[PDB]
Amino acid sequence: QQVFQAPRRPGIGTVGKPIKLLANYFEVDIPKIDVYHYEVDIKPDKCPRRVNREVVEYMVQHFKIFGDRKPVYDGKKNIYTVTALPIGERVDFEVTRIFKVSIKWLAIVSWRMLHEALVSGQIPVPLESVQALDVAMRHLASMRYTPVGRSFFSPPEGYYHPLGGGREVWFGFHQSVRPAMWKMMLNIDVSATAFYKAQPVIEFMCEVLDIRQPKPLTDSQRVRFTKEIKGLKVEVTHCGKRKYRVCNVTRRPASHQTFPLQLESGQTVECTVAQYFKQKYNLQLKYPHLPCLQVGHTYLPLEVCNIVAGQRCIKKLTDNQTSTMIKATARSAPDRQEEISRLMKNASYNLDPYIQEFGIKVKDDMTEVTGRVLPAPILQYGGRNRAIATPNQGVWDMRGKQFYNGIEIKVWAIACFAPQKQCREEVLKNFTDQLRKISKDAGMPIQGQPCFCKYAQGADSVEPMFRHLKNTYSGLQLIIVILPGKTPVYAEVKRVGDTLLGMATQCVQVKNVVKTSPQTLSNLCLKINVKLGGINNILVPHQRSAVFQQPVIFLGADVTHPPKKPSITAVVGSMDAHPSRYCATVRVQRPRQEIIEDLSYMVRELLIQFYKSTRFKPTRIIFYRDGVPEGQLPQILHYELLAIRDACIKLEKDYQPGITYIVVQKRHHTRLFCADKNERIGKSGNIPAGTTVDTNITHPFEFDFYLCSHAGIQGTSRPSHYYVLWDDNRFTADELQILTYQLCHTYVRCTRSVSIPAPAYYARLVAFRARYHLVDRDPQALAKAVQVHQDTLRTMYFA
RNA sequence: AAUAUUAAAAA
């Protein structure tokens, strides 16, 4: 039961250059009628939704209970009809496989009430009415395609995008219905996800093992193959195709794996899989040296199995697979716009008989919305120049500029973990020469040559070397670590540097040492300066929100879930009034838990550090929360607002700073496109950085907005969505939109406006770093692993 | 790991 009401929208923004946009939201007209909600209970109880749908489809065809109605169904418990069914609780006995089915009336759901919420803004949006509409509009798609979350996919036709390792890309679309002012909106986007190829198990095995001289699998090969195929469904081909789920792969080859077979004589014998296939099916195995799949002592030789079609790949993709998939699926904004428009035409929503049954109509053109391009802030640099930077198309640079507070680097070391042959002494010297030149220009002078420069190999060499360095070189400020590509050395450098010894480290791939770029070296300096306590730039102070007239702390929070492994929570807090410098807190928690369990304590730590750093108690807390699943906003808000308040009260009983709580979401399918082709930016043709929308496609009365704060480089930009779930601070829409945009210009790792505010982005980096610190059991040990060293606690080690 | 953006997230 929600008790913290989200703020109503205080108004719409008026600041910024108007820009005409199109959104992939299509207006939906609904009849102002009652719809009838029935519960369906199917026994057996835990069949796949696709099986449940088959059952209800059978019943609807065979029991016209239903009359001439066309019910819609969610594949679970919920059926809806446009007029009442001629019943009171009805029990059915279906043979399609025998099912016991019961149906009973549950509710009347009002679309008149839904309409009233959308037009008047005087009542809550009735979620039960929205659900009925969502179910009706996706019913037919759910019968035709393969549903995956809120998307639909179908087998590749006319295209083929293998990812290697027995996986391929399927294209489809996302569909959702959302309330807006005046009308419901149908959100449609194209999508793509990885599925396992429908192919023989032997072929899947060869892809997974990178097999192009028949011999048994090595122990390594078998464990590898097992991890990939365990949990997948296979179908057999020797019986003319029964499906099974794979629970293991046998240690023994088919030639030697036995099971107990009872003979006619009553005696039970240990029969091998190969012998059994020969006698029972007259099947001589071609690969008896390969193991068997254990399914359901049921063992299947690999060669009688195929991977069942339509299985989405849930496991993480390799870097190559991920790169391949991004390539195959990237689309410019105008191309995506056309694909969506084309999809809508081919879909003919208005000709769907369920949509017709429920009197629904869908507009076939994208919704027009006038957005505004917010002004970008000016950044203030330091040095003798005291230069300013004026972002242009979301970007600026360091030319002629020096850091606001640049650190002088007097004592530094180099540790090269790439082989000396691939990174010679003269090459290291050219690298350091160029870096010192760039660092000087940036106002972060590296005074001399390194105190120490050594070659090493293997993760095991890191701690001995770093301990030596810490002990031998007083006042050591930095170790630059050269790495030979992707390596376990990185995780160990960060474990030892961040958690064990508390020493600043900056890693660099050998490829960027061998061939240097001024841009790459300049970017390295942005990180080094901040890691060593400096400030790269600040927002020009007089052009900020009035919240800066009193002490204010900005917090960013994120939660990361495992692909056993814990979930990781991270909260960062600003430590100055700029805001530029941040400190981080991080914890491990129960896997898949979405609420930040330890939020109160983490906030308390950050408030305490803010006081130490500034000598002020914050009178306002501005909290940007990333990682929140759609649908769970009320629950996360309830517990976390209380946890932030708890932190305050525990510091001092009457401490009640004004809290603004904002959810940041990039994982949605709202896309915005320039309506005037003339205003598109770059090759990708995206909306300009700063494009903001708070009308037409946003909530009918709550306080949410889209802001695409970044320049789109590739594909179609995702505009970040911001939901203001609490605001004690009385922000105007312009004020809070502008503040959010300015914070996207304070992110230290690049001279660009990034897609989410720096505090949220930092929390993401802190959580990701904890995953490296955890690279290697009991909960106590895991918690210790992510605790950074005392000398690291107060630093931006996550930059 | 210079960096942002970008797809997904019976036997």
Q: Can you tag this structure with a few keywords?
A:
transcription; 11-stranded mixed beta sheet; Rossmann fold; disease variant; globular; 4 domains; RNA-binding; intellectual disability; 20 helices; RNA polymerase II cis-regulatory region sequence-specific DNA binding; alpha+beta; RNA-mediated gene silencing; 7-stranded antiparallel beta sheet; paz domain
What's the multimeric state?
A: monomer
Please state the CA-atom Rg, rounded to the nearest Å.
30 Å
Here the CATH topology of the largest domain equals Nucleotidyltransferase, domain 5
Distance between the termini: 40 Å
**CATH homology-level superfamily of the largest domain:** Ribonuclease H-like superfamily/Ribonuclease H
CATH level-two architecture of the largest domain: 2-Layer Sandwich
Number of helices: 20
Portion in helices: 25-40%
CATH domain class name of the largest domain = Alpha Beta
- What is the count of distinct domains? 4
As a percent range, the share of strand residues is 25-35%
Biggest β-sheet description: 11 strands, mixed
Shape field: globular
Number of strands: 37
Organism: Homo sapiens (Human)
InterPro entries: ArgoL1 (IPR014811), ArgoL2 (IPR032472), Argonaute_Mid_dom (IPR032473), Argonaute_N (IPR032474), PAZ_dom (IPR003100), PAZ_dom_sf (IPR036085), Piwi (IPR003165), Piwi_ago-like (IPR045246)
Region (Interaction with guide RNA): 276-281, 485-527, 667-671, 710-718, 747-772
Main location: cytoplasm
